[PDB]
Symmetry: D2
């Protein structure tokens, strides 16, 4: 059949769009038909002219990453580096449309390299899901909380949770009561995957098992916002979520002077009064930094991460202090307790994003040490954030 004939068929059969994929056979043609169909529903039918769609691998997207596809959005990818981190050198891909961001981050990388590099450590690793359940009375929910805190109750819960996956290993439970409601924060490792779907599956089976001991328990929602996913929350800041990371470096006074165009003293004064006092006056929870979100977002988009997780992933406290023999060298550290990231699944299944992951040497699963690729990616993110903090802070300090 012809395009116009498919169009007539879809319009004359009230067959909702998007079903084009199962209707036709080729992937790009279904996309071309949906764009044509959509075009007649717009005040400017030619508005899709510059929205590219051709020569793109839609097989990996369909049934996995997006629906009602009408094309793709190209985000410029720049590179910042080398980032000298833990005695290795990384060339960091950054997808952004903000001018000077890559340049500024690159300058930061330069100052770190000339300073002998940066060191980083993964402090914790565990994705979470925090469902909300209800009991008839608060006295009952209290009983469930006490039961879940015994070694016997936990083991049975861990047992049912762990049985849904090879990588699902329940670490701990933080429960919280609000009258007859009970919020249960399940935390578990997830190999190299960010882990949402995996932890969710585990949580559902665990809640099913919990319901066998407490038949009167009502499962209100698999997510009761106690995770907390994609919303700002003190719980992620205080207890961590995903990967908690810290990185540090010392920048020689000469480098601060020549590369950063400022002094260690001026940098410290700006850090304390902007990142600590300013954030405090603004009523911030977890936003004790200059622009971690810029770096997190740019790397996330380039590497197939869930960019909406930039909300909590960007949590960061940037600290600066005088170091060295004469207290003229700049010590800097960035602590990020909740980097939600992965190197397998979701958008990391797509080839262009796998390319950016390969650039860093962390694409896909780490066979001999599950989770190591994801941990390495989190360290790179924390290191690039520190590079970004150094540069922007120097620019603010200099004027």
């Amino acid at each position: 059949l012809s395009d116009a004939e498919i169009i007539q068929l879809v319009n004359a059969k009230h067959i909702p769009a998007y079903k084009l994929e199962t209707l036709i056979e080729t992937h790009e043609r279904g996309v071309s038909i949906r764009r044509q169909l959509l075009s007649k529903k717009l005040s400017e039918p030619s508005s899709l002219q510059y929205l590219p769609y051709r020569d793109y691998n839609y097989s990996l997207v369909m049934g996995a990453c997006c629906e009602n596809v009408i094309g793709y959005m190209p985000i410029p990818v720049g590179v910042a580096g080398p980032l000298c981190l833990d005695e290795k050198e990384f060339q960091v891909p950054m997808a952004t449309t903000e001018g000077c961001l890559v340049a500024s981050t690159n300058r930061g990388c330069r100052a770190i390299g000339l300073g002998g590099g940066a060191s980083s450590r993964v402090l914790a690793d565990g994705m979470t899901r925090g469902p909300v359940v209800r009991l008839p009375r608060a006295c009952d929910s209290a009983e469930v909380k006490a039961w879940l805190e015994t070694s016997e109750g936990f083991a049975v819960i861990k047992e049912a949770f762990d049985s849904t996956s090879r990588f699902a290993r329940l670490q701990k439970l933080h429960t919280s009561i609000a009258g007859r409601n009970l919020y249960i924060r399940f935390q578990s490792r997830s190999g190299d995957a960010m882990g949402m779907n995996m932890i969710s599956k585990g949580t559902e089976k665990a809640l099913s098992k919990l319901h066998e001991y407490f038949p009167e328990m009502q499962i209100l929602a698999v997510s009761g916002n106690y995770c907390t996913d994609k919303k700002p929350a003190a719980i992620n800041w205080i207890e961590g979520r995903g990967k908690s990371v810290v990185c540090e470096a010392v920048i020689p006074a000469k480098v601060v002077r020549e590369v950063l165009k400022t002094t260690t003293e001026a940098m410290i004064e700006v850090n304390i009064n902007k990142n600590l006092v300013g954030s405090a006056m603004a009523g911030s929870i977890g936003g004790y930094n200059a622009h971690a979100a810029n770096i997190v977002t740019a790397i996330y988009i380039a590497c197939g991460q869930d960019a909406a997780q930039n909300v909590g992933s960007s949590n960061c406290i940037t600290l600066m202090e005088a170091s060295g023999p004469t207290n003229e060298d700049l010590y800097i550290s960035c602590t990020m307790p909740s980097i939600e990231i992965g190197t397998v699944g979701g958008g990391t299944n797509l080839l262009p994003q796998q390319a950016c992951l390969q650039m860093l040497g962390v694409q896909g699963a780490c066979k001999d040490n599950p989770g190591e690729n994801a941990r390495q990616l989190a360290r790179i993110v924390c290191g690039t954030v520190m590079a970004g903090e150094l540069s922007l802070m120097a620019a603010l300090a200099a004027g």
Copy 2:
């Protein structure tokens, strides 16, 4: 030739060639030099990017764009572009749009409009910073600061000042309209000239940083939640019991119970400031990427309180509202200057400046975002309530 050049858009001719060479140079520094093969770069207009949106360019990252709609908002119909890699997001949001359309559509209102910049300055003593604060709060002091701020642009118009003291430090939050631009650069230029003028009245004042994190830009902050930043928007709709039953697969009562206990109580137990919603960030992020917005601003732009109530003659219909006090957005400048993103903006009829009434396109885009968020909230909440 592609060889002894190693021995770029500033030197060479073609833009696409400079990228090829940059990719070649970078290739030699990679553990897996072949990785760059699946990273696209050809047939892309780098002219608009170079010197404006990105540096050290090695290609571009394609983000699948799906469409959700029609979104029946304020008696208009919108086809919403969403750039995402999260499966079922577009489908779920589309389902939400469906429920709203069958309910007679959604209504929205822009409550406030004003981008901010909050520099930190210091005086010798707290007694001096207090004097500067008092002067900034007089009608004459504001008038002179406003005269100086507004002289930097045709679109920059200072609306108000909120000053806060921390001993000898003084944080000044400048809030101004910025036409159809998100306004960061414009407001920053205005802030610098205003601070310069302030310095003439108080020579002992030290300008510590043009941004003292009191804006607050790209970090979570109660100040953006309470006072707004960019566009403050509210939207609402009533979904008929039958639609909740047939499209959403649940009941009004179940939806309400989930909203209260998840979006209100749950977020409260989590210690959230501004995160009284299910997944506004998913919608904000997807639209932001497709429309050339600054995706990092998703941090504060996603602030939202979702409310659900029993409505109608028999209290069986679902009333829903989403209030978003800090949508940082624009239809001119930055990534909106690129053609593919302009295409998504054109889809919504808000591309570029609204020559007649500067700001209307940006205000319309903020209303669409708030409306799409409500569609997304409706669908995901129904799915959680139904199990």
Copy 3:
């Protein structure tokens, strides 16, 4: 113990009437001769109901002025609770000297605060400024639709809309002068934060009366508006809230002082460098790691609470009144002197009304020279008290911080 019909005197007989006619114990001072035997009977009625009838033995009740407490400060009175009052000072503030009364049961608190005052005095004193003054009340109202509540918000934001509201608000008292309106929307709900001066009074009752009259006026223009609650927690009163921290509530105050290196060494037993490092890592970084909003200090609450109890303030207001950011930095020719400042944006306080009407608390207020209304300049006594509180807090911060810096 005469029968009931005969009883028109005698404790045992009153008790029999109370039990038999089931007339409540609070109706006692309204039926009994003196205030004192009225509570006596009450304690006796209560004592019978306890698992240990002797419990009240050491709870004082005699020789106390209940006339001022009745129908004003407390109900079902069974006595009074004595809180030890100590004095810290002199506090050299704004070229004046204050002897600060502190009611507390925490050992070493007055001593430590006194040491702080000493370091300040030897440093040339402290300076303070009142940055803002205005008590608030934040009611919640509802409109049928969010589009309507948005309309009310815009109306309240026009110059004419504000004038009619202000006119209504101000007609309730000579001191009620509406300053501004902060309005916030949540769907069809509308939260309105009314802010106004209140002379020397803390102002809750006054601002509330003004808010009710203003809401009725608003109701005339928007008849479909439902007044859900005179307080929708948007004030915010007695609960932690970022809004009080960011916009202030009551009196916003800042105080500062410079402590000479020698004084930090000899009086505080530490160095300026050590103090600064503890302040930054405890009051800034530590509070940040703890997820604090407004708690960037060491123990402002100890000082605020002690002064509030001694001066008849509402001690429950210690929740927001204690908000404070303490900052320390190197000062002087050789950067060896300690610069310190305390910023408190929401001190809820008053020198007239409530517990300040009682004699013992008026005594503590008199000690500071701020008791009652300031005839010549309304509000000045309350402002002076707020400055004293901020200054005493700084004295307390200096001493405790030095003790943390020095020992361990």
Copy 4:
């Protein structure tokens, strides 16, 4: 004579220098009177006939008298099948009356039930290592079962009630914040937990000599300052209480309806507190009740800052959904029945009134737990009454 003693001084060593306590106070008062802009201002500040024996060198210094706070009683509070007569020290008119009305509605509803969910006072010191890599190593060390046991042994060796439970650590570059949590019998426990923290830190220092103990309290406890950590992880006693008020009682005692109360609770205590940017303040006036009971019972009133954290929830229940279900959850009630101001006779009297004075001989900590339950129950009574008044107008 007072006159000659005064000329001698021309100091705050009065109690030691002389003999009788009351006279010491008398003399300090006379000396202070000459420094005041108004010499007779102390006239109505009482000071006579007071057992300063227990106060001198334990509860207050430079004593010049005492401040009388009116004590009222609210009750009976029907809680967990028991009846309590609750002492409330306040100067706020109608507070006791309103709280009493709340108690009445609860009693007529069949009483309230409560549960202690957690119990453990905390202290959060801040230490520093040369590098973030070192602090990370200490964090990992503290997380192993062996490293924990060693710290726990040193902590528990300091006192009879020092049982170190979970250990929460947090890193900020080279800084390390360690939240020590432990039971403390019937004592509020700050002094005890502090003593335990110091020995534990010395033991930790033996394994990590490069570690600098910056401050025994790094504000990570967190004591007397608002903090999300206390709300989320609890501090002291975490308690929950609940009750169901029959429609008729809501109508006759509270002068309103269940529907009206629910609408006010949701829009004020949840939405309003959310719009205000509150962390832990999802209630109407828990602080009023916490403060009044704390003052009357010798607690540390400054701890009302975190002790008043509370989320009040209301729901329609019953056959026709006209009855009122109510719950109050308070995760951080810092309280005790031994030590500090509870050592004073008048406050012990108020504690006795509740049957929780001093140590619980048979079951250590039970008196303090009982007092926390009473506080949470009285808060719920206060929430019910004020909410009804706001609902009614």
